[PDB]
Structure 1
Amino acid sequence: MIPTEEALRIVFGVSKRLPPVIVSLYEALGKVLAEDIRAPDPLPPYPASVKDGYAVVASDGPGEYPVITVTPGTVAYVTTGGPIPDGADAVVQVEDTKVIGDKRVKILIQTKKGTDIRRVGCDIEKDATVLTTGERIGASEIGLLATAGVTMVKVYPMPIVAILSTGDELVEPTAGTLGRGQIRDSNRAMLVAAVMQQQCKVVDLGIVRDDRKELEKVLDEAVSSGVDIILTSGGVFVKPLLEEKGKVYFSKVLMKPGKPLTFAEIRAKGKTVLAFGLPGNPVSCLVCFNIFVVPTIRQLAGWTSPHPLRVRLRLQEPIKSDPIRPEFHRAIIKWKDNDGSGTPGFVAESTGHQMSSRLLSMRSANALLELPATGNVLSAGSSVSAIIVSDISAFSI
């Protein structure tokens, strides 16, 4: 048995960033940039008016002028975002003007040079680096790529993940009345969804029975298909099959929930494939995915910060620590204007009983409280470290 910290260090040391690809602008969304992006022209590329009004020679000052290149004694109409004609050095917004006669315009104020003008390149200078390698592409970065005219982008791809379930007792989730000794396969749909939330392509390999030849054939098809990660759950015939096909780095971790977790590296007949022999118990299966698979997906996708967000929060109820195993205690956290100590902060409620077979303990859990192995009851209002496992922007108030 190895601590979680060593198991992560081993996974980070074995895991390698995927080779970069060129994708279309909308396929680049969510991906990490594999090249720097430079503006080929300035923004704005011409002096642009900030307002609807008249382009003037600021020195002329208040007066009546004909509307027409702008020379002293003349003005020209401009619109927001339109170019300033040559010779004009300032814009007088339409509110500070009046049309005279049944074209002549009366400028009502004394303006200053460069007023209501965006000079060439004041938002983005030509050849300036607008985005760098290692930067994740969100909506604003798509806007910067579009501004710079980059519609084909070099990025790190997401890994392709194969997923299978193991068990003679499993039936498909479409099963109605269950026969003797049968349960619905819940890990596969759960892991397919968890991987879809990580924006990875999934290869669903179905239910495999507790049969060595059958599992070997499915693992071989997975390796041969070109996937980067294989997730199995249960049966940890899995560990011995992964030892035969490649290198197993660990098979047991000091943690609650669970204990078994096999991590292996296989060489395709060639690229390497990472394999996680996840525990069968639904809770341990999803907790191991959150702690060990998520940072691996991120690392393969070129994330420079693959680790999950860790915060400090206050317990809303007392929680019993385990005397030997450090726990990943499921919780529903929220930001409060008063966290219980007077100042604002995160607070956590337990999801109830934490048995590894109890999938209801994962229901609505947006964090994993890291409880050290002291054996003591942590009182309500005491502080703990917590790993955030679901979109912090989608957090309920």
Structure 2
Amino acid sequence: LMSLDTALNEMLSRVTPLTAQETLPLVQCFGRILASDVVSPLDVPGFDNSAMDGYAVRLADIASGQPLPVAGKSFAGQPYHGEWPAGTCIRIMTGAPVPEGCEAVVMQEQTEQMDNGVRFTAEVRSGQNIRRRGEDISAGAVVFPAGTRLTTAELPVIASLGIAEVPVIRKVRVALFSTGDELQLPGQPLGDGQIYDTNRLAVHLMLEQLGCEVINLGIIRADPHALRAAFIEADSQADVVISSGGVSVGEADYTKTILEELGEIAFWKLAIKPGKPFAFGKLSNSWFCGLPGNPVSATLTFYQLVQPLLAKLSGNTASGLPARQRVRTASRLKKTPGRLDFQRGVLQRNADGELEVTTTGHQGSHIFSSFSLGNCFIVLERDRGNVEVGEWVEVEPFNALFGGL
């Protein structure tokens, strides 16, 4: 009955971003949120300099109408000096500093020349083609705000200003555990209705990729005491505690009881497919997310619910979770009204070079394989029914957590 949107907002509304901070050299700062504005120690460019390669000119000698001969020149970290002879232009080259008292710059390609005077064409505006000191960054100004996620895009600019290190929010810490008599670890035999734990490994891998500190307390044994202790310890060392499965998501049993007695926890039933149940509330000193047990359900729930929560918790000012984009279905899709289906899809170029989703296969949450052969979701609007070939449909490309990049 509850909508992904309503729940997403319900979660994020109560989250107060972390603000503890440490200061590390740029090379360690990838994907780390910035603690405080970065303030440029130097003007960049450091001095007014030539837009193109061509000729630096005084506006005096232009309609002067006689051609102007190259008296001198300025290039890279070599400047120009020796008082500018009135009447002459100066062969200057892109990036190069202008000589004192210049007034414009003209691309020699515009202007044909000769062996004793260079002749210009257009009337050539004032200040033309002088990239000025600090046009790109001014000293004292704000280069990257608090909250900017550091990528290869921002960190080299920082390095360019002579800075060796920046303040950044501490990594988010997320404690992780599973439970249930059915669950066994690699090695052990399989009892009767037994399976190996997979959700925990799945949530770990994505937490680490997302840049969290994971604390993985294993498979708490099926006893209301083991469990109380799992929570005391998880809550004591994390900002978020995540049940990969086994702790209850609505069904009564001693796990619902330890949860209710150890914090304030809601038990949502979201209008999504796959999934539906999702457990979530405050603990003594952390947040709790309680994944449903089905691998696909858990994964998708985490991906669309918990992932966005860790972003806000990190200090990140962005809206961390890919954009969708409308594309034509090349496959008939079985959608049932009443639930928002995050079916899995395959974005491929048609013969025309445009995009079109194909379905991955059977969308039953009885199998994980759709994450592999897909590269995106097909978000199928809540109220929509079945979809025919050629109809339009929203699509959300996966991200790093599932392939490429």
Task: Say yes or no: TM over 0.5.
Answer: yes
Instruction: Give the Å deviation of 1:126.
Output: 2.9
Q: Give 1:327-342 correspondences, 5 Å limit.
A: 327-336=341-350, 338=352
Give the aligned partner of residue 384 of structure 1: 393
Moved more, 329-338 or 180-189: 329-338
Conserved 8 A contact 1:330-1:351: yes
Say which SS state the counterpart of residue 144 (structure 1) adopts.
Answer: helix
Question: Which residue pairs with 2:178 in the alignment?
Answer: 165
Quote the Cα distance in structure 2 between the aligned partners of 1:120 and 1:350.
Answer: 54
Distance in 1 (alpha carbons) for counterparts of 2:321 and 2:182: 35
Root-mean-square deviation over aligned CA pairs:
3.9
Kindly tell me: are residues 255 and 93 of structure 1, through their superposed partners in 2, closer, same or farther at Cα, counting changes over 3 Å?
A: closer
Q: Is the 8 A contact 1:329 1:369 kept in 2?
A: yes
TM-score (norm 2): 0.77
**Contact 1:56/1:70 (8 A) holds in 2:** no
Moved more, 359-368 or 147-156: 147-156
Name the CA shift for 1:393/1:211 in 2 (closer, same or farther; >3 Å).
closer
Report if the CA contact (8 A) 2:70-2:91 is conserved.
no
Corresponding residue of 2:112: none
Give the 5 Å matches for 1:337-356. 338=352, 344=354, 346-356=355-365
Tell me which residue corresponds to 1:138: 151
The answer for the alignment partner of 1:72 in structure 2 is 84
Paired residue for 2:282?
A: 265
Give 1:307-318 correspondences, 5 Å limit: 307-318=321-332
- Percent of aligned pairs with the same residue? 32
1:190-234 deviation line (CA, Å, top 9, x unaligned) = 111111221222112212222221122112111112x11111122
SS in 2 for 1:121: coil
**Corresponding residue of 2:294:** 281
Instruction: Tell me: CA distance 1:26–1:364, structure 2 relative to 1, closer, same or farther (3 Å).
Output: farther
**Partner-residue secondary structure (3-state), 2:270:** strand
1:250 is matched with which residue: 267, 272, 297? 267
- State the partner residue of 1:102: none
Give the superposition deviation at 1:368: 2.5
In structure 1, runs of 5+ residues without a counterpart are 96-105
CA displacement at 1:247 relative to structure 2? 1.0
Residue 11, structure 1, aligned to residue 11, structure 2: yes
Match of 2:241 among 230, 240, 243: 230
- Secondary structure in 2 matching 1:33: coil
Shift of 1:288: 0.4
Can you list the C-alpha shifts for 1:161-213, whole angstroms capped at 9, x where unaligned?
A: 1111222222223x276454432221111111111221222112212222221
Cα distance, 1:20 vs structure 2: 4.9
**How far does residue 334 in structure 1 lie from its aligned partner after superposition?**
3.4
1:44 equivalent in alignment to 2:40: no
| SS in structure 1 of the partner of residue 154 of structure 2 | helix
Q: Note the C-alpha offset of 1:76.
A: 11
Cα distance change, pair 72–12 in 1 and its aligned pair in 2 (3 A): closer
- The size of the alignment, in residue pairs, is 375
Deviates more, 1:352-361 or 1:364-373: 364-373
Distance across 2 between alignment mates of 1:372 and 1:94: 59
Tell me how far apart the structure 2 counterparts of residues 66 and 84 of structure 1 sit (CA, whole Å). 9
Matched with 1:189 is 201
User: Higher strand fraction: Structure 1 or Structure 2?
Assistant: 1
Structure 1 stretch displaced more, 355-364 or 176-185:
176-185
Cα deviation for residue 312 of structure 1 reads 1.9
Amino acid in structure 2 at the alignment position of 1:350: T
Of stretches 145-154 and 194-203 in structure 1, the one that deviates more from structure 2 is 145-154
Equivalent residue for 1:99? Answer: none
Q: Which amino acid aligns with 2:309?
A: T
CA deviations on 1:60-90 (whole Å, 9 max, x unpaired) are 9426779994223599999986756667888
Q: Paired residue for 2:64?
A: none
TM normalised by structure 1 equals 0.78
Q: 1:178 to 1:125 in 2, by over 3 A?
A: same
Match of 1:62 in 2: 69
Distance in 2 (CA, whole Å) between partners of 1:92 and 1:323 is 65
Cα displacement (A) at 1:114: 7.9
Q: State the match for 2:224 in structure 1.
A: 212
Please give the alpha-carbon distance, in whole angstroms, between the structure 2 residues aligned to 1:23 and 1:91. 44
Contact 1:49–1:80 (8 Å) recurs in 2? yes
